[PDB]
Write a protein that binds this ligand. Structure first.
Ligand code: GDS
Ligand code: GDS
Lengths: 220, 220
């Protein structure tokens, strides 16, 4: 009775996103279902909790010792954007949320470019902004300013891409889902989404999807 | 003298990597030939040099205003890893350096996972280590140590992956190429590669390849 997909996750800008896609897929195709394994991302739990991202058994699934990761009938996939691509290729047969590499090589490339932009830019830089507010023991203005300025620059790139559209590649798909995990916590990072009104409306359009709520809530 | 790919680049851990793949492809297939446009990545040059990453004309090719980017018969691709994937899909017809998404969905997924690992882990974090240790106008020991330590953690993940192997996914390919651009300057960043002897031997075997040297040199 095991589900075909197991999602190892935590309620975070990265952990929400495969669950969002899984719920979107279910709403369209009727499946697949998934099992959720809630993992500790607290360094104070290292060694002493089985479901903890540094525990060795989990490194066989995600060698980086971070969430999210999935297994699909035993096959492991780590890194948010790679998980989204995997799930789309295996379950999104009508291309509702993703572009086909064979029939749409240029559109597929576009999708990869925006995923990699988020994966190398928004996620890392907004995460460093969060680091220097929440976790660094001292206030370090050089670093706080560096990462807030860089996050603002990246959100301007995103806002400009959203001008004249409702979604990054026109129709809602996995590039929106990846970025949305971070964009919905942008205010708490110190960005003003009212300064990026295309981004703000896009976050609101996605937040109101029932599958998005179900995916976020599955991580709690 | 036809050049169907134009590579907008600079001699940097990201700039080298598409040129390396282009030269690997040229050695196996006899093409594609390419033009190199050397771009200033310096803020001091903004508005003062035509070939500068924040120039409006370039934002039409790379909306993030960073190198590398390519055009292929006019079609733009930005983000190192997305460029590698595009060039592989379009020119690596015998899959000498890359896995096919249709014929090898598992291997293709693994390749994406390691590219995304590098793109969200090694490049961003080693780039921050370089910023604080090498380029910032003030020395901030907390930040230097944070990003040197995180780089070391990421290199330990890579070193353990390379145990028992010569290349990340068995045969040399685009996942190695992506990380190699950063790993070859790890000593400069501040990592002692003797502490990562699998990474060290892997850097050495890749550095010796004539196509690698040709790609690196093309960015000067
Ligand atoms: N590139 C990976 C990133 C996954 C990731 O960062 N997972 C986090 C929780 S998401 S919460 C956001 C996360 N922050 C952290 O993980 C903070 C702790 C970390 N050790 C540090 O020192 O920064 C971050 O900034 N991410 C940057 C990015 O997405 O590029 C995790 O498991 N952390 C546990 C641990 O590190 O032990 C992906 O896309 O899947
Ligand atoms: N994710 C992109 C990154 C491309 C990139 O960083 N390009 C750099 C040169 S490569 S040199 C390595 C680069 N450092 C820089 O670009 C230093 C300047 C920057 N503004 C800063 O303050 O961080 C870096 O750390 N990159 C992190 C990563 O790869 O994730 C660039 O054009 N800089 C000009 C500019 O910013 O105006 C990719 O993979 O293509």
């Amino acid at each position: 009775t095991d589900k075909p997909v197991v999602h190892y996750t935590a309620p975070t800008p990265n952990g929400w996103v495969p669950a969002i896609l899984l719920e979107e897929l279910k709403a369209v195709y009727g499946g697949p279902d998934y099992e959720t394994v809630k993992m500790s991302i607290r360094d104070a739990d290292i060694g002493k909790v089985h479901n903890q991202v540094k525990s060795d058994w989990f490194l066989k699934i995600c060698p980086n010792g971070r969430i999210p990761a999935i297994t699909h009938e035993g096959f492991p996939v780590f890194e948010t954007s790679a998980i989204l691509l995997y799930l789309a290729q295996h379950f999104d047969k009508e291309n509702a949320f993703s572009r086909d590499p064979v029939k749409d090589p240029k559109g597929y490339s576009e999708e990869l470019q925006w995923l990699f932009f988020a994966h190398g830019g928004i996620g890392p830089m907004q995460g460093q902004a969060n680091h220097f507010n929440l976790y660094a023991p001292e206030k370090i203005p050089y670093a706080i300013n560096r990462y807030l300025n860089e996050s603002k620059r990246l959100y301007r790139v995103l806002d400009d891409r959203l001008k004249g559209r409702e979604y990054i590649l026109g129709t809602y798909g996995i590039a929106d889902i990846k970025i949305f995990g971070w964009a919905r916590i942008a205010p708490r990072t110190g960005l003003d989404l009212d300064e990026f009104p295309n981004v703000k409306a896009w976050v609101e359009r996605i937040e109101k999807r029932p599958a998005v709520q179900a995916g976020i809530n599955s991580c709690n």
